[PDB]
Design a protein around this nucleic acid. Structure first.
Lengths: 155, 164, 97
RNA sequence: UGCCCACCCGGUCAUAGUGAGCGGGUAACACCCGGACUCGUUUCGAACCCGGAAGUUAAGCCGCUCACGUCAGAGGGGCCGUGGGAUCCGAGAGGGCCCGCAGCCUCUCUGAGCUGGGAUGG
RNA sequence: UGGGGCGGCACUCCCGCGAAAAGAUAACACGGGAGCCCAAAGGUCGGCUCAGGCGGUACAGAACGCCGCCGUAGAGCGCAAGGGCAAAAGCCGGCCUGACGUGACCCUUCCAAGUACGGGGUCACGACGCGAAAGCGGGGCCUAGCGAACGCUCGUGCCCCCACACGUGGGGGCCGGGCAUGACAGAAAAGUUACCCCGGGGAUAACAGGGUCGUCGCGGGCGAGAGCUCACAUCGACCCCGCGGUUUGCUACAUCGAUGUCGGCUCUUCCCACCCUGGAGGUGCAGCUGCCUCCAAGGGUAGGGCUGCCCGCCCGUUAAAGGGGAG
RNA sequence: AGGCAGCUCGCGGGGUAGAGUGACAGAUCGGGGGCUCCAGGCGCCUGGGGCUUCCGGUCUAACUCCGAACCCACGAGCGCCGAAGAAGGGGGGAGUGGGUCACUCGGCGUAAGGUUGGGUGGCAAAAGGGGAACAACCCAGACCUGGGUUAAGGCCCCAAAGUCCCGGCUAAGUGCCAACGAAAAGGCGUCUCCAGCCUUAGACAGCGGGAAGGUGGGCCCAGCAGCAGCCAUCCUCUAAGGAGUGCGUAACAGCUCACCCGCCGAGGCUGGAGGCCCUAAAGAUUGGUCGGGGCUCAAGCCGGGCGCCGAGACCCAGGAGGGGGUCUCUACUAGAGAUCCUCUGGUAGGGGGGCGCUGUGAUGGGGUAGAAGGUGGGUCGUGAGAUCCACUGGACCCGUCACA
RNA sequence: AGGGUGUGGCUCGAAAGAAGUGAACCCUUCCGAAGGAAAGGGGCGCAAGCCCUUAGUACGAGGAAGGGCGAUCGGGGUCACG
C-alpha cells in the first residue's frame, strides 16, 4: 500500500450524471486531462470507485511525482495567494511556504502532501497507442497501479 | 390463437384462484403413466434450455404422442414410466373485448383493457428445467429417445435429451 | 385508482411483529430510563401499544429530546430541510448508539 | 472464613423450552394438620383467607440422563441473486466478461443457562 | 373520458396489491368497503380461558349436564380488508357515566415545499367514577362513518340603539351548538336543430398515408390416423415455428385559412403465392382422362342475365376464361 | 461564520430479488401401510369412495419460519465552497402548469415510433466531429485569430490515413449493418474440440466359399415349408453358423438377416456439442444492391497485433469583454487611466450600457447661395451608426449639455 | 441552385485610403512557445514493427535586424476550378 496516488480525468464533462459530476468537483477535476495528487486512504478510495468510469489512477513513484510538480505554468502553480504561480525555481518557495507548509525550503524538499489542479496535455503517441476505448472497463479507465507512471510521462 | 402471443413473459405470475373468477379446466389430467416402482436401468430426461411459458394445449399434445409411441412399441403397464413434471399454475388472459365489446361503441379500443382468463400455462423461470422423463430397461433405450424427440416437436421451448 | 391516505395505510408489513416479539409489552428495562434534554433517540413504533403512536413516515428516524409533557416526550426530528416536533410515549423510543 | 446452593425481589426472555425416568433435604422452600375468629365458597375450609404444627422427600422446587424443540460452529448435498461498465454476444428472450457485495434450505457431527440486589445452609 | 356519445364513477372517504426492503409515485389497473350501529357493544375493578380432540357417565345422539387428559390461539373482539391481543384487548360478574365544563399544542389529510374541513394524539385548571393502591378513564383494540360565507334558530353572561336626556316594548352585538350543499375545498337550472351561425382545433374523429399483425391470406415441422397390407401416390387430427401487408381492428404521428369521399368506363404499367400456354419428375401412371411436386411472369385470361354496387349466384362458350399493387 | 451536492467509519431502520412449503393461507402430482362401506368373482381376491399415517414432486401480484445486493436517518472524520465571489432575514419583476426520445426497473396490452409510473441523459434552450443523409445515438460544451496533440470513428477508389502483419474459416457475391432486415426444422457440406466401443492374437468396407443340416419340426391348415391367428427352443460341432431378417410367394423356392474360412494389410465405428455456410427465405407503390465503384489465401467473417489520420475537446501564442480586489486625477447624475485574479452556448424571462428620428431652453458653439435631399465611391466603429470625396441640386442646417 | 472562402484570368482605379520621409517582391543572419523527426550505428521479434544513440538536434507559430530592386498595393466588377 503506497502512500500517494495520482488521478487523471480522461473524459469531458458533457452528459455526465448528477452524482458523478459533483464528486469530481470535490476532487478538483472539472474538465479533461487535469490531474491531482492525494494520499491513499479509505475515504478517497470510495470516491474513486464512484467516478471510476471517468478517471484513471494508481500509485506514484519518484519519476512520476517529480514530473507532475515540474509541469506547472503561469496559471498552474500552487496557491501562492491564488495566481497559480509557476514554480520554476526555489524563489517562490523561499517565501510562500511560511504560512501552512513546513520543512519545504528547497525544490528537493517538496515531497510531502498537497497540490492544485495540474493541467495536462493529451498523451503523446495516441491515447489509443495500445487501446481503442477510454470507455471500456479497465480497457483504459479505472485503477491501473504502477502503470500510471508511464502514462504521466506521455502527457 | 398463435402460440407466439403466450410464449413470452408479459407481467407477473397470475395464479391466485381466490381473486380470479372463472378459470377454464386444463387439458392435462393425467401426469404419471406406466408402472412406477418397476425395475429400470435408464432414467433419461427432457431438459429445457430457455425461459418461457408452455400452454396447457402444447403440454397435453406432447403427452399423448409420447404415450402412444411407447405403448406402440411393447405394452402399457410394461417397463416404462412416463412422467410430466410441471403443472400449469399461471393463468393467461385475453382482451377478448376486441371481439364483442370492442364494436358496440362499448369499452372499445384500449379502454378498460384488463383481460379475461382463457387458459393456463407453465412458467419456466430457470435455465435447464426438467419437463418430462421416462424410465426404461436397457433393451428399450432406443425407443425411449425417439419418444422424447417426437414430443419435443410439439413444445415451444428448445430442449435437450440427457441419459443417466 | 389513487391510494387511500389513512393514518395506517401501506403499513401491512411495517407494523408486523415477529413471532418472538409478540405480546403485551415485553421490555421494561428500556422504560426505566428518563431521557433528559439533549439526548438522542430513535423513533421505533411498537405495533401493539396503540397510545401516542407516531406516523409511518417517522419510523427509524433519529430525534433529539427537547422537553416533556406528562409522560410523553417532545422530540425534534428532521424530515427534509424541515424541523418537526413530535410528542411520543416512551414505549415508542429507544436510545441511540 | 470462604466461595456456590437454595429462598425473596428481579434483568435477559427457548443456547434458557416440553415430556419421561432418577438423585437430593433433620435448617430453608413445600406438600401437610385444623377451622373458634378477619374473610370465603350462585354447593363444597377444594380454592381464597385465618390458626397451626404430627408426618414426608412421594409431588412442586433444584440437579443428572435420554428423547424430541431451539440457537450456533463444522461438514456433505439442492437452489441462486445483485450495484457500476462497454458502437460486448444474440432476431429476441436471455447470456458471457471486467470492477464491487452476498444469501436461503436440507442432512451429519459437537456443545448449550447466564446474570444484579438481600435473609437461611455447606 | 385511448374522438364524442351510451355506459361506468377510477368525482368525498377507508383497507390490501400495483410500489422496485427509507420517503414520494400514474392507469376507464386488480380484490373490496363507508355515508352507520351501541346506554352498552362505553369507564373501572375482580375472577376465568378459547376453537378442536380423547377417556368415563340413563334417557345422551358427532353435537345438553357431570368427572378427568391435551390444546400458541387453529376462537372471539358490531360491520370491508389489513394489523394487534392469553393471570388479556376475549368470556362472566360488581359498582358507575371521563360519550365531562373551559383553554392550548402537535401529527395526518397535505414528503422535501403553500393548503379548508374531518380524524387522532399529549396536556393544564375544575369536578367525578372505579379500585387497598400505584393508577386508569374527555367513547367504541387500531386504520372509514363526513361539510364554507350569508340567513334562521337554540344555549350562555354581559355590551349597544343616533341631530338632547330618561323609561317601557322591540331590535342588534360578542362566544358555543343545530338546520346543507354526495358534482362531497359548496350555482338555484330540460331538450332540440339535416334551417342552423361564429371563434377555433390536425391538442380530436370519418377517407387517405405511417407504426403493429390479434383478425385475414399463405408457408414449414410433427405425424393421430385412412388408403385391402403401407404414415408421407393422395389426404392429413392435436400441437409447434414463421411470412405478407391485398381484409378487419388497435394507436392518434401528418393534413381542420380543404390532398374532391363509393362504383363504373377509358388508358398505362408492375408483383408472383402459376389459372392456361413451355420444360422435368412421381403415381394406387396400360391407353384417354386425372391427382401431386419443382422451374418459369415471354404471351393470354373473353361475352351475357340479376343487383347502384363489391362480393356472389346463374346462361352459352373457351386452351384458360388466376389472384393482387400503383394516395 | 459556517454549509453539504460526494465518500469512509460507527450506530440504527427496512421485508424487495432469491429461497421455502411439516412455519400460517390457498393451490397441486404420484406411491406404501392401517380402518370402513359398496359392487363383482370363487372366508379370500379385484375395483370405487371416505379418514389417518409415512415417503417423494409442482407453485403464489393481493403466502412468509427466513432473507441479499441496495437505499435511507444521526454523530465524527475526509473532501470541496466561504470573510473578493458570504448560512439566516427583508424586498422588486417574471416565465412555466401540451413535453418528447434513448438506456435501464416495472403495470396494462398479441403488439406498437401505444399508453401509464421510478432512475439517469440528450433535445427543447446546443454548435462542431462521427452515424450515407438524421431534433433524440456516440465524442464533445463554440469569446475572436493562428500553431499542435488526441476522442468517437476510420485507413483499396470516391475521401485525410494500411492494397498493414500472424493463425484459421466461407464459395454463397453469403457478406462489406452498434442502434438496422429472420425463426422452428434438415445437411458427416466442410472445419474443431468430449465420450464410448472395436483394432497387427490382423478392425471397418469389400470380394469367393462355407453361405447350412432333424425338419420344410411344428399348433391351425390342400399349404404360409422364419416373416397368415399364440409360442418354445434342442447338437453330427470346431479354423464354421441362430430353431433364422426384409423381400415375397395360393404355396414354394430363392436373394438377403447371423456366424467362420481365404485374401488384404492401417486404423475404424456410433453418440454429444460448437464455427461458418446451404435449404427453409415469396411483392409490387415504377428501375440494380453494402451509400456507390467494386471486392474471392478478400476490400468478407472469427481469435490477436502494429502504425497512422482525424473536432471548436485538451495544450500554446496574440487579441477582446464581463465581474472582483488594490490605486491615481477631474466643480463628478460622469469621464480618463495603471495594476493583479478569475470567467466566455443559449429560448421564455430578469438586469447593465449605447446608436438613431422630430421639437423645446441654453451654448465654448457654429455653417450657408457653395444648405437640406439624391447617386456612386473612400475611411472609422463588434455593432446599431458616424464622417468625408465627385457629380446632381437651389435655401436652409448642424456639434455639445438638458428635456419631451 | 448562392452566399462565404482559396488559387488564377480579364477589366476600373481623379478624389476621399497607404506610399519616393519608399508600395510590392526577393536574399541573409538572429531569437523562438506548445510540439518534434529521419538517414547512420547497435539490439529484440516469424512479421507489421519496437527499444538505446542520433537528440529535444533539424525543424516549428510568431518576432527582430540588416542587404537588393525599385512603383505599385489595399479596394470595386465579372469569369473558371477546388
Amino acid at each position: 500500500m503506497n502512500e500517494l496516488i495520482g488521478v487523471i480525468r480522461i473524459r469531458g464533462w458533457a452528459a455526465t450524471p448528477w452524482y458523478i459530476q459533483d464528486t469530481l468537483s470535490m476532487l478538483r477535476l472539472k474538465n479533461a486531462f487535469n490531474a491531482m495528487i492525494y494520499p491513499k486512504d479509505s475515504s478517497i478510495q470510495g470516491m474513486l470507485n464512484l467516478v471510476s468510469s471517468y478517471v484513471t489512477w494508481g500509485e506514484l513513484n519518484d519519476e512520476g511525482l517529480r514530473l507532475l510538480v515540474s509541469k506547472l505554468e503561469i496559471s498552474r502553480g500552487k496557491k501562492v495567494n491564488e495566481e497559480y504561480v509557476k514554480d520554476k525555481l526555489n524563489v517562490d518557495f523561499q517565501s510562500f511556504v511560511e504560512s501552512i507548509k513546513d520543512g519545504k525550503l528547497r525544490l528537493n524538499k517538496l515531497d510531502e502532501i498537497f497540490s492544485l489542479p495540474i493541467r495536462l496535455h493529451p498523451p503523446k503517441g495516441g491515447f489509443k497507442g495500445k487501446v481503442s476505448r477510454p470507455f471500456r472497463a479497465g480497457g483504459e479507465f479505472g485503477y491501473r497501479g504502477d502503470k500510471i507512471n508511464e502514462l504521466i510521462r506521455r502527457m | 390463437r398463435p402460440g407466439r402471443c403466450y410464449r413470452k413473459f408479459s407481467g407477473p405470475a397470475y395464479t391466485r384462484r381466490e381473486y380470479i373468477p372463472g378459470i377454464p379446466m386444463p387439458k392435462i389430467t393425467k401426469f404419471v403413466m406406466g408402472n412406477v416402482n418397476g425395475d429400470y436401468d435408464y432414467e433419461l430426461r427432457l431438459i429445457t434450455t430457455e425461459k418461457g411459458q408452455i400452454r396447457h394445449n402444447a403440454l397435453e399434445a406432447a403427452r399423448v404422442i409420447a404415450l402412444k409411441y411407447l405403448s406402440k412399441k411393447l405394452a402399457s403397464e410394461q417397463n416404462f414410466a412416463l412422467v410430466v413434471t410441471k403443472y400449469p399454475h399461471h393463468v393467461i388472459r385475453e382482451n377478448k373485448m376486441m371481439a364483442f365489446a370492442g364494436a358496440d361503441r362499448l369499452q372499445d379500443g384500449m379502454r378498460l383493457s384488463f383481460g379475461k382468463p382463457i387458459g393456463t400455462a407453465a412458467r419456466l423461470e430457470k435455465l435447464g428445467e426438467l419437463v418430462m422423463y421416462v424410465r426404461v430397461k436397457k433393451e428399450h433405450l432406443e425407443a425411449a429417445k425417439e419418444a422424447l424427440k417426437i414430443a419435443s416437436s410439439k413444445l415451444p421451448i428448445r430442449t435437450k435429451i440427457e441419459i443417466s | 385508482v389513487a391510494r387511500s391516505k389513512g393514518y395506517r395505510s401501506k403499513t401491512r408489513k411495517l407494523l408486523e411483529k415477529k413471532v418472538r416479539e409478540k405480546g403485551a409489552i415485553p421490555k421494561l428495562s428500556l422504560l426505566m430510563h428518563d431521557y433528559s434534554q439533549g439526548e438522542y433517540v430513535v423513533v421505533k413504533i411498537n405495533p401493539s401499544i396503540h397510545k401516542g403512536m407516531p406516523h409511518r413516515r417517522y419510523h427509524g428516524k433519529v430525534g433529539l429530546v427537547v422537553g416533556k409533557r406528562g409522560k410523553a416526550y417532545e422530540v425534534k426530528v428532521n424530515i427534509g430541510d424541515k424541523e418537526r416536533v413530535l410528542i411520543v410515549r416512551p414505549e415508542h423510543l429507544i436510545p441511540f448508539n
